[PDB]
Paper text:
Royal jelly (RJ) is a gelatinous, protein-, carbohydrate-, and lipid-rich secretion produced by the mandibular glands of nurse honeybees ([name]). At pH values below 4.5, as found in native RJ upon acidification in the mandibular glands, [name] assembles with the small (5 kDa) RJ protein [name] into long, hetero-polymeric filaments that can reach lengths above 1 µm12. These filaments were recently shown to be responsible for the high viscosity of RJ, guaranteeing that RJ-embedded queen bee larvae remain stably attached to the ceiling of the vertically oriented queen bee cells. Here we present the structure of native RJ filaments using a combination of cryogenic electron microscopy (cryo-EM) approaches based on tomography and helical reconstruction methods.
The resulting map, calculated at 3.5 Å resolution, was used for rebuilding the structure starting from the previous crystal structure and including the peripheral [name] protein loops responsible for filament-forming inter-subunit contacts. Overall, we did not observe major conformational changes of MRPJ1 and [name] in the RJ filaments with respect to the crystal structure determined at neutral pH. The resulting low-resolution ab initio reconstruction showed the overall architecture of the purified RJ filaments consisting of an H-shaped unit oligomerizing into a symmetric helical assembly by stacking interactions. The RJ helical assembly retains the D2 point group symmetry of the tetramers since both of the 2-fold rotational symmetry axes are orthogonal to the longitudinal axis of the filaments. Although the intrinsic flexibility of the N-linked glycans limits the map resolution at those sites, we were able to model one NAG residue at Asn28, two NAG residues at Asn144, and two NAG residues plus a β-D-mannose (BMA) residue at Asn177. The densities are ~25 Å long and are located at the center of the oligomer within a highly hydrophobic environment formed by the [name] alpha helix 2 and the outer 24-methylenecholesterol from each asymmetric unit of the tetrameric oligomer. Although building an atomic model for this region was not possible, the highly hydrophobic chemical environment and the shape and length of the observed densities are consistent with a fatty acid with aliphatic tails of 12–16 carbons, or possibly a mixture of those. One of the contacts is mediated by homodimerization of [name] alpha helices 1 (α1, residues 47–56) from neighboring building blocks that mainly interact via hydrophobic interactions involving Gln51, Ile54, and Leu55 of helix 1 as well as Tyr61 in the following loop. The helical assembly is further stabilized by a homodimerization interface present on the opposite side of the [name] protein, involving homodimerization of a short turn (residues 280–281) followed by a loop segment (residues 287–295) that includes His294 and Asp292.
Author numbering:
A (entry chain CB), B (entry chain BB), C (entry chain AB), D (entry chain DB): 33 to 77
E (entry chain AA), F (entry chain BA), G (entry chain CA), H (entry chain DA): 20 to 432
The structure:
Amino acid sequence: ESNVDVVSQINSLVSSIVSGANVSAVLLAQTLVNILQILIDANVF
Amino acid sequence: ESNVDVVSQINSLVSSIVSGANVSAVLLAQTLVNILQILIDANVF
Amino acid sequence: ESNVDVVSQINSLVSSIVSGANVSAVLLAQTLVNILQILIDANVF
Amino acid sequence: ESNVDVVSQINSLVSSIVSGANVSAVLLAQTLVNILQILIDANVF
Amino acid sequence: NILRGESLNKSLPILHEWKFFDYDFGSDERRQDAILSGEYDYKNNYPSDIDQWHDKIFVTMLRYNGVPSSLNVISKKVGDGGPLLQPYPDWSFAKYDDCSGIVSASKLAIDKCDRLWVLDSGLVNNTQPMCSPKLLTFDLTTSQLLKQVEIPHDVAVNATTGKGRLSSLAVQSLDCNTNSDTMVYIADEKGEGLIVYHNSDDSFHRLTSNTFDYDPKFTKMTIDGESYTAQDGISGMALSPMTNNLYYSPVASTSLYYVNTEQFRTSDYQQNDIHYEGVQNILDTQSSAKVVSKSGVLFFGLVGDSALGCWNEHRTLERHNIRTVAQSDETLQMIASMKIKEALPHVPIFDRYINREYILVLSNKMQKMVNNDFNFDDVNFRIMNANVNELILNTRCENPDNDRTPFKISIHL
Amino acid sequence: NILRGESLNKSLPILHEWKFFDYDFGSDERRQDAILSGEYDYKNNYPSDIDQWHDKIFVTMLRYNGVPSSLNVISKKVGDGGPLLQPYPDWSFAKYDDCSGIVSASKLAIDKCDRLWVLDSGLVNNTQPMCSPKLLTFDLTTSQLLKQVEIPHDVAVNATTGKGRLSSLAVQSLDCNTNSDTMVYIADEKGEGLIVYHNSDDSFHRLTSNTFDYDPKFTKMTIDGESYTAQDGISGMALSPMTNNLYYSPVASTSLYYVNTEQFRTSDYQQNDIHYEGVQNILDTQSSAKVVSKSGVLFFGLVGDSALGCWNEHRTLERHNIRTVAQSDETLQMIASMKIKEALPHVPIFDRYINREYILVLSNKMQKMVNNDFNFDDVNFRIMNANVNELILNTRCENPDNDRTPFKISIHL
Amino acid sequence: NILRGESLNKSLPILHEWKFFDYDFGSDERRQDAILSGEYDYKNNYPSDIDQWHDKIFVTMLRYNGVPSSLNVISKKVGDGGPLLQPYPDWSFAKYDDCSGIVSASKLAIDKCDRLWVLDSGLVNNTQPMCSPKLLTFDLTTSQLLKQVEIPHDVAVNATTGKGRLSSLAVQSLDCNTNSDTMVYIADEKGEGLIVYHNSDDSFHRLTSNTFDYDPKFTKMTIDGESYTAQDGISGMALSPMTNNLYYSPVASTSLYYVNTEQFRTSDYQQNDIHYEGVQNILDTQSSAKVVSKSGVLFFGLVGDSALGCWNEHRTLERHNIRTVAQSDETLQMIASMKIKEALPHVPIFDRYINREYILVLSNKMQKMVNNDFNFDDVNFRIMNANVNELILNTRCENPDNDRTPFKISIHL
Amino acid sequence: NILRGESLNKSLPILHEWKFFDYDFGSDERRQDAILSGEYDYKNNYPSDIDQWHDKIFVTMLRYNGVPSSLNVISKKVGDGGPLLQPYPDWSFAKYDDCSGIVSASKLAIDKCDRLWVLDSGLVNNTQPMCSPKLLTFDLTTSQLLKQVEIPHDVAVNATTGKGRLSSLAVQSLDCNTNSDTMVYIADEKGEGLIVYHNSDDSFHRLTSNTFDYDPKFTKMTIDGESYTAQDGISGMALSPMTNNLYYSPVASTSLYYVNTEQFRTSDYQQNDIHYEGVQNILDTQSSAKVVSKSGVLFFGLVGDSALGCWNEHRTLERHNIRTVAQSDETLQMIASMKIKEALPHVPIFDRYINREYILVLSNKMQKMVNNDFNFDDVNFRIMNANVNELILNTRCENPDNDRTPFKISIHL
Ligand SMILES: *[C@@H]1O[C@H](CO)[C@@H](O[C@@H]2O[C@H](CO)[C@@H](O[C@@H]3O[C@H](CO)[C@@H](O)[C@H](O)[C@@H]3O)[C@H](O)[C@H]2NC(C)=O)[C@H](O)[C@H]1NC(C)=O
Ligand SMILES: *[C@@H]1O[C@H](CO)[C@@H](O[C@@H]2O[C@H](CO)[C@@H](O[C@@H]3O[C@H](CO)[C@@H](O)[C@H](O)[C@@H]3O)[C@H](O)[C@H]2NC(C)=O)[C@H](O)[C@H]1NC(C)=O
Ligand SMILES: C=C(CC[C@@H](C)[C@H]1CC[C@H]2[C@@H]3CC=C4C[C@@H](O)CC[C@]4(C)[C@H]3CC[C@]12C)C(C)C
Ligand SMILES: C=C(CC[C@@H](C)[C@H]1CC[C@H]2[C@@H]3CC=C4C[C@@H](O)CC[C@]4(C)[C@H]3CC[C@]12C)C(C)C
Ligand SMILES: C=C(CC[C@@H](C)[C@H]1CC[C@H]2[C@@H]3CC=C4C[C@@H](O)CC[C@]4(C)[C@H]3CC[C@]12C)C(C)C
Ligand SMILES: C=C(CC[C@@H](C)[C@H]1CC[C@H]2[C@@H]3CC=C4C[C@@H](O)CC[C@]4(C)[C@H]3CC[C@]12C)C(C)C
Ligand SMILES: *[C@@H]1O[C@H](CO)[C@@H](O)[C@H](O)[C@H]1NC(C)=O
């Protein structure tokens, strides 16, 4: 997953959440996976 | 991540957990990411 | 939350999952909260 | 858990995270449980 | 020999149980009106077949005088006697006076197409044929009657005897794609015959053999001491997915036979050609219902001993290999229906960590129904669930296993 | 009879295996120097006992001429022959020339106090006593020698024969609080005696009986066809947590006896008072090692048939109840050590969902060691892990089970 | 003075932008047919008001000759000019020939009841009254027309002049429980009047004052250099939740007035009684649209300077306190609609960590519409989103803040 | 002009505060013994500099008669007056009688190498030089004294006047790899000089100029009405990471100068060559301490007005651009130390969503220390934390911002 793609996914997800629409489970799970992978790559843990 | 690699990681993690050793956070996070990705690929959500 | 209540919730949730019905998000979240609280009480972490 | 207690726990956890110290797993899990319980009480899901 | 020592007094977990059957008419006043009008009577409700779909338990009731609906799904509301039933899909199909609705649902079957196949016996009181038998195909996602076919009279009953009652239904699908090439097998015990229906061809063919006929020596059946006499032919058909073999055994005999469905692939349907392979008198008691798991294990119900027996298809068919797993006089009186399902959702990678197959068994006291001696103060009808791998583990019926994972998970309802 | 039919050719998952034993001296040059100096020889390393602690596998080696260290923990580095061993705690205790370190570690035991109990045989080549036997208590969290006690010479060996070799060690703790009241039992086969050591009293007491003596008729033992003669007394002691009964059986006999530890609670230690309850000749072959799970099941190793047998304590002790679970000539040559552990961390609520007990078995070819015929091109020594509940399921050894949960999880290493 | 130095050339993030407006007729052939029939023309589409609901952006189009639908929701499909609009709810309401559907949607408002309030101007070409004005209440969860009311002719237009066009709509609800006591205020600039409609009473009342009339001196308005003359009365009403004060300012004047809605609570509606409190000539330029946040800050649009100004209600009303936040000639040509929303879901505890209020501003070039000089090769119409707290931070308009949390989160669409 | 209107009475969040300073000697009896022996006195403890590392707040105390330890880390235990201090690393370095330990820690600095740089003034009572000044490098991960260097006497003090006190310390690292090329700048006000120490060269060079000298006209300083006279030279050095410019301003003047560190890269160190660029009298009051953020904003403390001012490096240096952000007489009496840190852990992708820079400011009442008038019943010493981006937002000091994300997070301790 490209970094710009992850940024776009995060921007879409946050906008959908704050808008009040029903957030799809698959999109949320994919965004969570991408964020966790990025954090692992940064040796956060 | 190869499927056999994911299976090996799961087998090592479960063995480490049931053994009683201190489970590393990075390995647990990586296994969680792989399992979530596999579940997403299966359209579980 | 009573321990017997937690056991009943887990038994209902697993049965619903393996049955193939649509699992409600609120019930899953409540079961997760109860399980995490029980694990914390046991000093697992 | 009192609401003021939850607020104090969140304030301590965020300060510890941004400070750079090693965040204890039990405190993070307890804060997560409290936040999830509060969200459930608000019918977010 | 066949009765294993450890199997004695072993029971199965009970998913649901009824002292008697009560229907969810709605308000209590509606139930009172139904009882007063004679539509509903708690003494004339007997289960025939059960099935499960994602949250639903479908139960079939033999159409007697006091039966409100033949086919009913278990509802959430729980009565004093037991969980309340609800007509499926609605009360429109329960009205069998016009014959548009289901008269009497004999057996049920669910394929991988998420379609419900319903067999209508047509017989009322199980002895009087009121309307023509029907094959109904329902969509379980839309709750609509997809298709309805009427069985011809000539193939339904013998031309000589003139009597015939449909008893068992099995559904096989070579390919359940956009067009489902499904071959439906209907075994009628009273006619001692088999009916093969080809959905693509819309054709019914009737087959008869000496194996389908009953043995007068074994007509008497003793359950829990009480004995009753029944004269029925072939019943309890189970189709093995692995070997494509349809197994059967006459109700009034102990011999066990099977046929290969590949012989039915030819449109010729040559008479007297079909070769039935079976063994004569391999069981001490009769077999009521049979089911074959995808692993290759056949489970049958020993009526006389009131037990559950298993046989592995890979191993040879003989009395030495046949063994029992569950033995209980009270819990398992008469096994009328057995269905083997698998856990969901399907994940190809994780299948090595999980034993997915679980069996559902229906137990109703048929010897009490025949003799009209039912104690409605006790639990008469039971539904039980068990895990196949743990039920057949460390026995003759077990398959060659390999413990390649640190943990194994057993799943049952 | 005792040999169950389905148990035939059944094996266990292999956690680790060695063609031979290689030690992690460090650099390859250090290994070369050790081999040249004669300290290390790959032909004189034989496993005696194994144990596990949270990530560690401790293995004991009989002190021969070419043994670098008696007690070694499995290291992460893997050699060509097998995983490399590492001296524990360091090389300081490996130096047995001064006798300060461990001369020869015979058996191991781990209590709930997280303490390691080490028995020092003292014998070199298993026939020559070099230094006095020792009982060592190590802390597994700090890797320090907490305590060391020396066994008196008089209680160690018979005054008449003058010969004695310690063979089995068992640790029981009535209370492992701040002061651990632990009664350690040491069975010596050569002396045909038992030694009870009271940690609080710091006292050793020697007990002898006709049951501890060997039977000359059963001295010959045949493993995998090859036969060897051994004359040894009581060995293979297992202490049942549920009944507080110490089981035993002489190496050169098939009879099985047990004693109650409550008789040892009295400080009197009245001679000839102790009542040993046992059955004579209940097994076709001899028993090498025994272990009792917390559920109440005793597992023993049939040397002659090369198998694993089980017996439930609740049921009566007879040949009818005794059954085998695992049978394999190659996988299980000679069972020298068996340890039953449980999954961690302990959660009281979730215990109903998980089968926690798992057994670890060590298999070394003793008949090859006796006859000095070892093929180092094959897998000689094996360590296997299995799940107790799934190993004894649907057998005579199984405990009364209740399936009260939708899912069950089986855990083994 | 009023124009803050740092505000110069500052712009706002753009949520969406259109070179022109294109409608999602469906297939391209349907669009071709619509263009050929004259129903759709890209030169006669101008935005009037915008609103947001949970995923939807409603936009109102002034009913000209070539307008397909007055009210349209932004659709997912994106055309070359911009995102495609879709008629709401369907094409049935777009058909205004029968007058059953919406003729011309002037302004929109959404209450906390999740109801959409639509004002129908009735005027076509903004100068010819075709059908009677309407107040429509839609349910945004069911997409159904809950209610429709017709405004009386006498209260709609002046009896003397005979001309009147509804310009601004505001909705206030004292209690939005099962029965919603909502008082709707409709300001008509051409009639220079205000209409108060009581939903419970189903009554319309017309109020007039000298403040509602325009000033001939300030009729000329210069946007981006180009000047146009307009003579309009009261427009741009904003109701403050905190103080229950309805603010207003005539289009052709710079004075700013407000009224208290508590005077309207009395059913008497005493004429000449209503006291309007305002300040004369506090702004250099005119104000187009105004909106009041729940914190107590009023935002207005300076047409002449093409900027956004703010005023805090707590502080005194004077030129000293009034300051600008955003200044841009191209980005903000003419502000026609402003709506302040809050983040969801609402969590009472976490409100201290999050700045929830975000403002949406619509910018369309009205001076080009008046002079019929539109360059369709550029971005003519824009929608912008901003965060109120960060927009007014460290200015005269900011409220007394307290940094009591380690982290603060700013939320905008 | 410089004093912004909205900045009036604005305060900052208080991380910690002390009525007076109390040390964690351990038991209360040890504290009593320390007080009796005269080692500890609560009237002679004044903070000099503060710093933060991952959980630790280091505070430096001027070495007076009653100071137990010069450098102390904030401990978890909280006394009645305030949080208790703890000697760092231990009491061994607190013993300055042998001069082995730190005599008086003047200033602190932390680089990206995770190393603590400590400057030892050597002066006791700030007027008497006891031991030689020292530069100490500690490892903050191992709590060990990595390195210690002694400053030469000739470069420390003027040869003519003979007096010199080190006041400010700044650390710059061109490359903090395995060998850290760090150039340390030490400004001494009493000597009116600058000392450049090259760690690689282990060389100290002294530089003097007319700019480093004080102005007698501005010696008087008025804080909170109370006025005191001080004659000090260059102090308060801040090194800009972006431009590599070291800023400074004499204590007794309002002019602000800066130098470029690139001139110091040449090993020549040509005298009278260094070109200092500055503006004369751009501030109404003096500047105490300065710090430059990585964004390019310089923060300084106006002593006379008791405020915090900012200046953007990108914009021109003039009185017009200089503005104040925080104004408070009580909260900010005299700013002695300012440190700008960033949030952790560093994530390159998420930097667009988070404002990471946060400033820590120490406020101690120096005018009370000079006049020996301290009210120990009130909060004398304060530590405050603020977020830089939100502190400078919508002002002259703000950098060109772009709102490219839906949400922005502000982080401060
Ligand atoms: C080592 O010394 C012990 C004594 O401390 C010897 O134990 C004794 O062994 C003899 C047989 O070798 C036992 O005699 C038997 O007694 C039973 C009755 O208990 C009787 O039924 C038998 O017919 C036989 O006479 C004797 O009881 C036993 N001592 C005790 C106290 O029980 C042991 O034999 C010595 N080891 C060797 C290798 O000789
Ligand atoms: C539409 O009709 C309304 C009446 O319903 C007109 O409102 C009236 O407007 C006149 C000025 O055009 C107002 O006269 C002014 O009165 C104030 C005192 O309130 C006085 O100070 C001024 O010098 C001036 O005389 C009159 O008050 C107002 N009516 C009411 C009830 O307030 C309106 O003007 C009509 N529209 C047009 C375009 O004429
Ligand atoms: C252990 C737990 C939590 C129980 C959970 C983690 C276990 C139990 C059932 C497992 C699913 C079985 C079926 C299946 C169907 C299969 O297709 C995917 C795995 C899955 C979902 C298993 C996932 C793991 C489950 C849910 C607590 C109560 C102690
Ligand atoms: C199903 C999964 C994930 C495997 C996980 C959820 C299962 C497996 C082992 C279980 C622990 C066993 C021991 C124990 C020890 C017991 O004391 C607590 C439960 C626990 C931790 C089980 C927790 C659930 C575990 C970890 C995927 C691979 C399909
Ligand atoms: C920091 C992140 C993840 C962003 C997440 C954790 C932040 C951002 C927006 C926050 C919600 C805002 C609104 C709201 C609405 C409010 O009612 C509840 C909090 C909530 C949901 C915030 C939750 C926390 C959110 C989602 C990565 C990308 C670095
Ligand atoms: C919104 C929440 C939960 C607060 C959490 C999700 C927010 C707050 C602080 C954010 C971290 C700031 C620093 C940083 C440092 C940066 O390098 C990575 C992001 C991170 C860790 C942010 C992650 C998201 C955090 C923890 C509840 C209380 C309503
Ligand atoms: C079977 O077990 C049940 C439960 O313990 C018991 O009540 C019953 O008597 C048993 N059956 C027989 C035949 O003993």
